[PDB]
Nucleic acid binder design. Structure first.
Ligand SMILES: [Mg+2]
Ligand SMILES: [Mg+2]
Ligand SMILES: [Mg+2]
Ligand SMILES: [Mg+2]
Ligand SMILES: [Mg+2]
Ligand SMILES: [Mg+2]
Ligand SMILES: [Mg+2]
Ligand SMILES: [Mg+2]
Ligand SMILES: [Mg+2]
Ligand SMILES: [Mg+2]
Ligand SMILES: [Mg+2]
Ligand SMILES: [Mg+2]
Ligand SMILES: [Mg+2]
Ligand SMILES: [Mg+2]
Ligand SMILES: [Mg+2]
Ligand SMILES: [Mg+2]
Ligand SMILES: [Mg+2]
Ligand SMILES: [Mg+2]
Ligand SMILES: [Mg+2]
Ligand SMILES: [Mg+2]
Ligand SMILES: [Mg+2]
Ligand SMILES: [Mg+2]
Ligand SMILES: [Mg+2]
Ligand SMILES: [Mg+2]
Lengths: 258, 130, 181
RNA sequence: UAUCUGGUUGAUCCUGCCAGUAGUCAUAUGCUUGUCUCAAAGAUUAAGCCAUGCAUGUCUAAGUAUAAGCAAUUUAUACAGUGAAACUGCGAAUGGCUCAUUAAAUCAGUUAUCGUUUAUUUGAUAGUUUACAUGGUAUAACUGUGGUAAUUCUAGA
RNA sequence: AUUCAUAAUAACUUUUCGAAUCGCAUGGCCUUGUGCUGGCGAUGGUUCAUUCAAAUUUCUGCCCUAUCAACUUUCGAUGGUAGGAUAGUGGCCUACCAUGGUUUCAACGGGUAACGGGGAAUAAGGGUUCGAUUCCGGAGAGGGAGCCUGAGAAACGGCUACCACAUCCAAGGAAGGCAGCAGGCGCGCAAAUUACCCAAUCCUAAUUCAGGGAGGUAGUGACAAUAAAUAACGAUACAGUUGUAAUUGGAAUGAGUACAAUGUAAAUACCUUAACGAGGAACAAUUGGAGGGCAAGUCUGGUGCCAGCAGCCG
RNA sequence: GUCGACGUACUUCAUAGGAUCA
């Protein structure tokens, strides 16, 4: 190619969007934004294919141009705005607030939240560095640059960002016994407690996570997101509480509830 | 008799309307016109007929029932504002715009691309030359 | 372009089409169940082969193997639901013992014959293709329709059918009009 | 190969042998071709040659209208409704097609940029630089005068 | 892990940036001035970070060929130093230096009807073959060479030369690139429509609206696949409880025709459905193979009257 | 030139044996 691509075939689109393979030939390409392409849910798919509010792309554009959709407390109008992990989607007319969280199956789940819990978000500190004029700043997983951080905040910590002011309200250190959420890999969507961090200089760090059912799994450190202390999450978790269930047990539960 | 049932009803304030699936049981009848269903839905939901839209009617194999998707807007102005132009034309709320076939429009676009400026000067020049 | 739509063959030619015993068995099956051509027998043989191969493969695995338990339970459930496998025979061993005739038995043509609506299997086929038979509230015009245990009790003449309480067909009212004239 | 059929002599058995009978896929071709659903369209190693037509343009309240544009108007003697043409900005490097070249090349998996550029999006970020606001160091569209057989040709004022 | 982030000192610059831009609206202070102050947005702008990307890059993995055994090095091949260039590392190039680098563990050379992969076929398993072709990545736009613009191009539905073709011409000149969608030629023997639409998918723009042969819709050789009509129930007759009906009775139904409605951007079609639509149900199912029998008939041969060939012809 | 060698492709000849019976 001679430049950046602007099209996305349906088959090449991220699996977890759950797009029909025969509805069309192309899929929404998320525009550049806070989140990466493969780890983002564009607003069109959220409003049309998940909430079923809009029947087709044109109605989604009609919704957005009315300025009813807010992402992280700011109005967005791009149909392909890449909403992602820990972003708050507010629809005032419906009096609805959503937080985008992966369910156990690894897909973004429609999770309804109260307004108070919608007042803030959580961000993984991706970088801590001194800016120009000797001003420290922190860059989070969603690309927010926050100046004058608390000095104790280090990389891989979690910061609770208030959306109204864009400032850090509190922070959680990455330590053993903390509650964490998996945001990548085959263990995507699971929740557990840290047990031990293996360090490999010049390589990818590994973290052992024990679930509430005492099952253990190892995951690369880049895919871990600290969300609180054990039993005291700082956000409301989706149904299932991040517990992975075997196929047989899922069958049993499904038959029972039916 | 004919019985209309509304199912999977969603209330969308964003588009200012109500979505649902309409199931029509029509024994001993071929099927029901969209106009009659629009009237009946308007009566049941207490709205203008102009504010009711219906489509996607496919009588199942063996006949006797039809299934499609139905919309009830809060007031007629919103119906005109959000409804697709073609569905408005179906209902008579809007008039079809007459336009030439795509080939003619594209050829005219190319011929205009050929000319630069208003073209009156070219007309006067050719008139003087000949 | 648009993503592919999958397709598959539902039948395969037997290893030996020319065996005399096979020809005789096909003749017997076709006559007993009123099958149009050998393609139906080949189709049902293909399905039964697929199920029995799957049953073999699951049996090969160790007992209590989670894949074995799950897949065997699902297969036995499906076979019991469709009526081929009886309630008391819920073991993969008895799945492996199935025969083609059991599948031919569940066909809507055979069931329509057995329940007494038709005087011949061919009469049942003609009735089915002429839109006279309804499973539940629904008209079915496919002889190869496989009837479930729940659905077997709801086979009846369709409401729209002249035999089901509707108006007489074209021939009947035509003759009545001619007689009246 | 397999099973089955037939020959192996004056006949019948038991061997052995021989001939024919298996397969889908692929190419070409013949005959037929009523209904429902669904779906594809290369090939002369000729990436050989193409008539004609179309396939990339784009304007919001929010860059520039004294169009001698349209329509309302005394809800405006600076403009303000709509708006051709042109300047300006953006796009045209996406998409679509083909497999000629290419044998550690491409490509697959896996690494690195403490070795570098990055329109755009998102978030931060600049009291330190006649002003009730500077020029043509300037032109398009437009008016008018013209050249060529001819072209998305353009010359002077 | 750093000469990292950042800061500071002294200077330097054809040297930048630090809002001379636009819409909507008319709030608050008073010393009552078209005084001071002030809201909601658009578009610009330095640097950092993020995102879409780009470039180079580490390890391992490619079919046939040894009757290709030595190759690379003069004109860069291996490495050092300094410089030029690059967005940047680097023999990428320049100048001076050394003589290096690969190879029977197959280098180098040759063939390839060689784009690579996800995959497809077969097989009991090992294996064998195919993969132009719905997705990913690479290269190209008749063949070489070279560039403006722009963040992004060695672009070709951008430009310039040359090579080859080829169009207009008043002979002075001008204009070319279907391996995009349709549609032609390449033979004297052949095969989809120069159709409709942006309604769904998403993409482009100053942008809800315009545009999109990308794409969708329909048309068209049985590509490859699914289901599935062409009759069912009786009576009578004839013939050696079986077979045969241009025998016979009234019941059912869709191929097709068609009000209507549904469907669609508008249509066609499907599913529905008033009304028509069956006895040779002539509403006339096909493709292959095997075996007969007949004459004042024909040919050929002979241990009479026969045998072979064959028989649309007597 | 109905030439030699080689390469390639095809054709062809070598199948009856034991037991019983007349
Ligand atoms: Mg690292
Ligand atoms: Mg009927
Ligand atoms: Mg033919
Ligand atoms: Mg027919
Ligand atoms: Mg029909
Ligand atoms: Mg080579
Ligand atoms: Mg390599
Ligand atoms: Mg842009
Ligand atoms: Mg910015
Ligand atoms: Mg001038
Ligand atoms: Mg040198
Ligand atoms: Mg150097
Ligand atoms: Mg090739
Ligand atoms: Mg290949
Ligand atoms: Mg390929
Ligand atoms: Mg190229
Ligand atoms: Mg060509
Ligand atoms: Mg080029
Ligand atoms: Mg192009
Ligand atoms: Mg072209
Ligand atoms: Mg073409
Ligand atoms: Mg096409
Ligand atoms: Mg603007
Ligand atoms: Mg048809």
């Amino acid at each position: 190619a001679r430049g950046p691509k602007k099209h996305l075939k349906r088959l090449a689109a991220p699996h977890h969007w759950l797009l029909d393979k025969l509805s069309g030939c192309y899929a929404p390409r998320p525009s550049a934004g806070p989140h990466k392409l493969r780890e983002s849910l564009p607003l069109i798919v959220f409003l049309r294919n998940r909430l079923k509010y809009a029947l087709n792309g044109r109605e989604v554009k009609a919704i957005l141009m009315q300025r009813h959709v807010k992402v992280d407390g700011k109005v967005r109008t791009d149909t392909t705005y890449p909403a992602g992990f820990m972003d708050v989607i507010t629809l005032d007319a419906t009096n609805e607030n959503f937080r985008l969280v992966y369910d156990v199956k690894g897909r973004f789940a429609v999770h309804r939240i109260t307004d108070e819990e919608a007042s803030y978000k959580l961000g993984k500190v991706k970088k801590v560095q001194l800016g120009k004029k000797g001003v420290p700043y922190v860059v989070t997983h969603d690309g927010r640059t926050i100046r004058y951080p608390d000095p104790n905040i280090k990389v891989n910590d979690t910061v609770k960002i208030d959306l109204a002011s864009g400032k850090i309200t509190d922070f959680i250190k990455f330590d053993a016994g903390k509650l964490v959420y998996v945001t990548g890999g085959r263990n995507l969507g699971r929740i557990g407690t840290i047990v031990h961090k293996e360090r490999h200089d010049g390589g990818f760090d590994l973290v052992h996570i024990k679930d509430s059912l005492d099952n253990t799994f190892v995951t690369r450190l880049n895919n871990v997101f600290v969300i609180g202390e054990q039993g005291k999450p700082y956000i409301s978790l989706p149904k299932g509480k991040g517990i992975k269930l075997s196929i047989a047990e899922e069958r049993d539960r499904r038959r029972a509830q039916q | 008799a004919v019985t209309i049932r509304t199912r999977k009803v969603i209330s969308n304030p964003l588009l200012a309307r109500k979505q649902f699936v309409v199931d029509v049981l029509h024994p001993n009848r071929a099927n029901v016109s969209k106009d009659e269903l629009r009237e009946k839905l308007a009566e049941v939901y207490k709205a203008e007929k102009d504010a009711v839209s219906v489509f996607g009617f496919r009588t199942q194999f063996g006949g006797g029932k039809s299934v499609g998707f139905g919309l009830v807007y809060n007031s007629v102005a919103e119906a005109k504002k959000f409804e697709p132009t073609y569905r408005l034309v179906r209902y008579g709320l809007a008039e079809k715009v007459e336009k030439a076939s795509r080939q003619q429009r594209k050829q005219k676009k190319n011929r205009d691309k050929k000319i630069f400026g208003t073209g009156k000067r070219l007309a006067k020049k050719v008139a003087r030359r000949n | 372009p648009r993503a592919p739509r999958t397709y598959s063959k539902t039948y395969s030619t037997p290893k030996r089409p020319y065996e005399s015993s096979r020809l005789d068995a096909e003749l017997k099956l076709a006559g007993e169940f009123g099958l149009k051509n050998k393609k139906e027998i080949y189709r049902i043989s293909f399905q039964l082969s697929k199920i029995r191969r799957a049953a073999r493969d699951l049996l090969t695995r160790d007992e209590k193997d989670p894949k074995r338990l799950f897949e065997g339970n699902a297969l036995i459930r499906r076979l019991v639901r469709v009526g081929v496998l009886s309630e008391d025979k819920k073991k993969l061993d008895y799945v492996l013992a199935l025969k083609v005739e059991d599948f031919l038995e569940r066909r809507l043509q055979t069931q329509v014959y057995k329940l007494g609506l038709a005087k011949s299997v061919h009469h049942a086929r003609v009735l089915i293709t002429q839109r006279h038979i309804a499973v539940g509230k629904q008209i079915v015009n496919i002889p190869s329709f496989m009837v479930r245990l729940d659905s077997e009790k709801h086979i009846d003449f369709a409401p729209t059918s002249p035999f089901g309480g509707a108006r007489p067909g074209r021939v009947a009212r035509r003759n009545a009009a001619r007689k009246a004239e």
